Amino acid sequence: SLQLLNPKAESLRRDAALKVNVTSAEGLQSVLETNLGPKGTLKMLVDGAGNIKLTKDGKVLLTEMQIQSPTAVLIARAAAAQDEITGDGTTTVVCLVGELLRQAHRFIQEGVHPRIITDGFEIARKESMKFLDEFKISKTNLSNDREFLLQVARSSLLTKVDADLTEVLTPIVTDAVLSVYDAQADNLDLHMVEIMQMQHLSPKDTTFIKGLVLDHGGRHPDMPTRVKNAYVLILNVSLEYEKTEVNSGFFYSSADQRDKLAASERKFVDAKLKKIIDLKNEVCGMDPDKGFVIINQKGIDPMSLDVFAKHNILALRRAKRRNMERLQLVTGGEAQNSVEDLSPQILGFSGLVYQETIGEEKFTYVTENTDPKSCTILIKGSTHYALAQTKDAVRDGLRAVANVLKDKNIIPGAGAFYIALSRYLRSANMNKLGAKGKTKTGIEAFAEALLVIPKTLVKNSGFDPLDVLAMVEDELDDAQDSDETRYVGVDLNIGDSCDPTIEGIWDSYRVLRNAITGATGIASNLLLCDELLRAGRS
C-alpha cells in the first residue's frame, strides 16, 4: 500500500524484513569472527587517500568502512559505544547480536511470535546479573600486588599483538597505572596516561618515561639542552603580535618620532620580561648547577627569544592545552597566568631535563621527579600504521586495567563466564523464573548463543570447536560433587581446557556487564521490527 502513498519507494516487511536483520548481522559477524582471539586474523585498511590502518580492533573496521545495510548501522553504533566507556567489547557485542538473531530465527520460522522471544531474553539476562555477584571474585587493593596487574594487562595485549610486544608493553602499562592509584582513590585516565606517536628505532624499543614529554624544543642554539635542576614556570600568557584592536596605529610628526614610536612595541613585551628576571633573582643561588625553564601554552615572539638565550632560559611555545594541566602533577608547582604576582612556591622541580633532536623535530624530555603525580608513555613505531596499531593496543589496555582499580572485583576470562551461564540457564527451574509457556524457548536461545564465543576462539586455532568443549562439560560435572570450586577456561595452544585464575586470564567487570545489556537491546529491537522502508525528501 506504500506505492499509493509515494511514487517511488522501497520497503520490505514480514519474511522480507525478517531476512534483513538475520542475514545482514550474519555477514558482519563473519568479518569479526576471525578477529576474536589472540590467534585471530590481522586486517589492514587502505582507503582511496593512501592512508593505511593496520589493527585488530573491530571499531576501526566499522568507522573506516562505510556500511550500506541499516541493520549493521545499529550494531556499529552499539559496538562503538561499548569501546567508548569500557575500552573493550567491540567484537564481543557484534558476536552476541549477530548470533542471538540467528539462534532466535529458527523458532521464528516455527511460528513463535517475536515478542515472547524477546521477553525471554530479559528473564535470562537478569539471571546473569544475579549469578554475576557469585561469579565475581573480590580483590583487595590494600595488598598492592604488582603481579595481579601484570596478568590482567596481558589479556588485551596478547589479543592485539604477539608475545614480543606484550613483554615490552606489560611493565609500561603497569608502571603507568601504578601512579594512578592514590589515597584519594580517584582514577583519572586521560591526564595520567597519554599516547605520543614518534618514529624512532623499532616498535619493540618502546620504553616508559616517568615525566611529561613535549613536542617542542629550544629554537635558539645557546639555550641549554641538558639542565640538571630546572624550575618550570607555567605561563599561559603569550608574548607576540596581538589582534591590535582594529589596527588603529601610530602617527609620527618627524623621522625621529618614527623610530621613537617603534620602541613602544617592545615596551609591553619587556614589561612582562622584567617580572621573570625578578623571579630569577630569588632562585639565583647555585645558578651554574641549577637552571630556569619556561613553558608557554601559545607561540612566543622570536624577538624575545634572544632575551632568554643570554640568561640560559629554555623557552617552549605552542604547547598543547592539556599539557598545561599536567605540569602541576609532574613538576609539583602551580599554574601562573598573570606575571604580576610571582612566588617561588609555584615553581616546579625536576631532577633531569634534556632534549633529543631527531630530524627536523625536537622533543623535550623531563624525568626524575621527587613525588611525580603523573607519567607518560612514549610510543615508538617503524611506520605510520605501526604507531596506530600500538595506539589502539595500549589505549584498549588502559580501560581494562583502570576498571580493575575502580571496583573491588574482577571477572575471569577465557570463556569461563559464557560456559557457566549455559549450565545455569538450562538447569534452572522455570517455576522460579517469571517466564512460562512459550517464553521458556526464548531463554534457551539466549543460552545457546553464549557458547559460540568460546567456540569462536577455537575456530582460529584450527581445532574442532565441538570436540574441545566435550571435555569442558565433563569436568564441570564431577567438580560439583568433589567439593572443589574451580573455573574452567579454554587453552588454544594445546587444544584443551585450563584455569583462568592460574594462567592469569582476567576480564574487566564493566565490559561484560554493559556488553550483555547492550547486545540484548540491539537484538531485541531487531527481532521486533517487522518492516523496513526508506522514505524522505532529498
Binding site: 586486517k43 589492514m44 568502512m65 628505532l201 618627524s254 623621522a255
Partner: protein, 548 residues
C-alpha cells in the same frame, strides 16, 4: 543458470570495498607482487648496479639506483608493498646506509616463505621462526667484527669507510670521489683530543652545490658556503687582507616601521621640509656605528631598502641576501657569529672572521666565496660538484650524503666496527644459522634453515650483475667455508668474497688488502627492519582495500 547470485548479501559494504585473504592464493599473489618491484632493485645492487629512470607527474626525472629514493616517486597500489616501501625509507633516514639491503632482504624472506606456506606452516610458526633466527643473527654479527677506526680523523682510515660506501653509488673513479668527501669531514670535526669532550657531528653540515659544466676532476672542497648571488653596489676582491669583521642580521636593514598603520603625519610645512632629510640621518647614524667597528660585510635576511644600501657603499661594506631561514642559520656557524635583531652596533665578541670573500665565474653565474683558510677553522663546509648532466648531479649529491651519514656512525657507538664486505657478511651467517637450526628441536627448524637461504641473494646478485654465471661462481665460494677451522688459529678464510668481472673464479684474495668493509651499525638495523617488513606481510591474514 544464466546469471550468478553475484555474492548475495554483499551490500553490507560499498561496492568499492574488496576483501582479500591469505586463502585462495592471495598471500601468494602478495608475494608475487613483491617480485615485480624486487627485480627492479636487484639490478641496482652493488657497484655494478644499474640506475633507473622514474618520471613523475610533474616531469621531474631522478636517475638513481637507491631503492629508498626510487620508491618515493612511484605510485604503489598493493597494500603489502607499501610495507616494503616505507621500510626502505626508514633505513635511509636513520643510518643513511644499507637502503638496498633492506629492499632485497625483506623481499627474499617472502620468496622463501612461499615454500614454507605450501608445506603447511602456519603464519604463527613462521613468525616465530624468523624472530628466533634474527636474535641469533644479531649475536653473531658482534663476534665476526674485525678492526676498528680508533682515532676520529686520519687520511688513510677515512678511505676504509666513506670510499666503500660511495663505491656502489656512482662508482666511476675511486680516489676522485673519496677525496672530495673525506676532506669536508675533517673540517667539521671539533678534534680537541685529550680534552675528554663528547664528540659531535651533524649530517646537514656538509652541503653539496650542484653546478653544471666542467668535469668531475675539476671539483674541489670549499671550507665556506657557496651561493649564487649578485653584489648590489660593487664587487670587491678584498686584497687588503688582515681578514675581516663580519656581522649577520636576521632582520632586514631599513627604518623601523610600526606594525599597525604606518603613516606619514605632517601638520605643517615646517615638518615636511625636514622629513626628507630626517630619514637620511637615521640610517646614517645607525650605519656609522657599524662602520666604526670595522665591519666590512653585513648579512641580511630579507629585502633591504635602497636608502640603507647607499651608506653601505660609502664605507665599502658588502651586502648579502639570505632568504628563508636554514640558509642564514648555517652562515653563522662558519664565522662563529651570533645574530641580533637590532640595527645598532653589534657586540665585538659576536663578530665573525672571514679572511677573503671572492666572486668568480664557475657555471656562468657570479658565486660568492666564503672559503676559510688553515687558521681560524670553520664548520659546515661545502663541496663544489661539477658535472655535464644535471641528472648525475642529483644522485652524487645523495651519494655524498651516504658518506656523510657514515660519519655519524662513528659517534654514537663505541667505534666503527668494520665488517667484511663484498657480501662476506651474509655468507658467513648462512653456515652459522644452519648449525643453529639443528640445535633447536621441533618443527621450528624449517623456518630457521630457510632464513639462512635468504642470505644467498647477496652473493648471487653481485655475481649476476657482474656478468658471471651464478652456478659456477657461487658453489666455488663455499669451498672456503666448507673446510671450517683448522687445528691452528689465525684463519684468514673469513675475508673471501664475491668479485666483479675480471678473471672471476672468486679472487681478490683476502678483502683485507682491498680495504672495502661494511658498517656493523648499518647491518644491525638493516636486518631488523627487513625482517619486520616481511613479518608484517606474513602476519596479515586478510587484506581489505577501498575504491579499488
Amino acid at each position: 543458470s544464466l546469471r550468478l547470485p553475484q555474492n548475495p548479501n554483499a551490500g553490507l559494504f560499498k561496492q568499492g570495498y574488496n576483501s582479500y585473504s591469505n586463502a585462495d592464493g592471495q598471500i601468494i599473489k602478495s608475494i608475487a607482487a613483491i617480485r615485480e618491484l624486487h627485480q627492479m632493485c636487484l639490478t641496482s645492487m652493488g657497484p655494478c648496479g644499474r640506475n633507473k629512470i622514474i618520471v613523475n607527474h610533474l616531469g621531474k626525472i631522478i636517475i638513481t639506483n637507491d631503492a629508498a629514493t626510487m620508491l618515493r616517486e612511484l605510485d604503489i597500489v598493493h597494500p603489502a608493498v607499501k610495507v616494503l616501501v616505507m621500510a626502505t625509507e626508514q633505513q635511509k633516514i636513520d643510518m643513511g646506509d644499507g637502503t638496498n639491503l633492506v629492499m632485497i632482504l625483506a623481499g627474499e624472506l617472502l620468496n622463501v616463505s612461499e615454500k614454507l606456506i605450501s608445506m603447511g606452516l602456519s603464519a604463527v610458526e613462521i613468525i616465530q621462526g624468523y624472530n628466533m633466527a634474527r636474535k641469533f643473527t644479531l649475536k653473531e654479527l658482534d663476534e665476526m667484527v674485525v678492526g676498528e677506526i680508533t682515532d676520529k680523523n686520519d687520511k688513510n682510515e677515512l678511505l676504509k669507510m666513506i670510499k666503500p660506501v660511495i663505491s656502489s653509488k656512482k662508482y666511476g673513479s675511486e680516489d676522485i670521489l673519496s677525496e672530495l668527501v673525506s676532506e669536508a669531514v675533517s673540517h667539521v670535526l671539533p678534534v680537541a683530543q685529550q680534552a675528554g669532550e663528547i664528540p659531535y657531528f651533524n649530517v646537514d653540515s656538509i652541503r653539496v652545490v650542484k653546478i653544471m659544466g666542467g668535469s668531475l676532476s675539476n671539483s674541489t672542497v670549499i671550507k665556506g658556503m657557496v651561493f649564487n648571488r649578485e653584489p648590489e653596489g660593487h664587487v670587491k676582491s678584498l686584497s687588503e687582507d688582515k681578514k675581516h669583521k663580519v656581522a649577520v642580521f636576521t632582520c632586514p636593514l631599513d627604518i623601523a616601521n610600526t606594525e599597525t598603520k604606518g603613516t606619514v603625519l605632517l601638520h605643517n610645512a615646517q615638518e615636511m621640509l625636514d622629513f626628507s632629510k630626517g630619514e637620511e640621518k637615521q640610517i646614517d647614524a645607525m650605519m656609522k656605528e657599524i662602520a666604526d667597528m670595522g665591519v666590512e660585510c653585513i648579512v641580511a635576511g630579507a629585502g633591504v631598502g635602497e636608502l640603507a644600501l647607499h651608506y653601505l657603499n660609502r664605507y665599502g661594506i658588502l651586502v648579502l641576501k639570505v632568504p628563508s631561514k636554514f640558509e642564514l642559520r648555517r652562515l653563522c656557524r662558519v664565522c662563529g657569529a651570533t645574530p641580533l635583531p637590532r640595527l645598532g652596533a653589534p657586540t665585538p665578541e659576536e663578530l665573525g672572521l672571514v679572511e677573503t670573500v671572492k666572486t668568480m665565474e664557475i657555471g656562468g653565474d657570479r658565486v660568492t666565496v666564503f672559503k676559510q683558510e688553515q687558521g681560524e677553522i670553520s664548520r659546515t663546509s661545502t663541496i663544489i660538484l661539477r658535472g655535464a648532466t644535471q641528472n648525475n648531479l642529483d644522485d652524487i649529491e645523495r651519494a655524498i650524503d651516504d658518506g656523510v651519514a657514515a660519519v655519524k656512525g662513528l659517534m654514537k657507538p663505541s667505534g666503527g666496527k668494520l665488517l667484511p664486505g663484498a657480501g662476506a657478511t651474509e655468507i658467513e651467517l648462512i653456515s652459522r644459522i644452519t648449525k643453529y637450526g639443528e640445535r633447536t628441536p621441533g618443527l621450528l627448524q624449517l623456518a630457521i634453515k630457510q632464513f639462512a637461504v635468504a642470505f644467498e641473494v647477496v652473493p648471487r646478485t653481485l655475481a649476476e650483475t657482474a656478468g658471471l654465471d651464478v652456478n659456477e661462481v657461487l658453489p666455488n665460494l663455499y669451498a672456503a667455508h666448507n673446510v671450517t677451522e683448522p687445528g691452528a688459529v689465525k684463519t684468514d678464510h673469513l675475508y673471501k668474497g664475491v668479485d666483479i668481472d675480471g678473471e672471476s673464479d672468486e679472487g681478490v684474495k683476502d678483502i683485507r688488502e682491498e680495504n672495502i668493509y661494511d658498517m656493523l651499525a648499518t647491518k644491525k638495523f638493516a636486518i631488523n627492519v627487513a625482517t619486520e617488513a616481511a613479518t608484517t606481510v606474513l602476519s596479515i591474514d586478510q587484506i581489505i582495500m577501498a575504491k579499488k
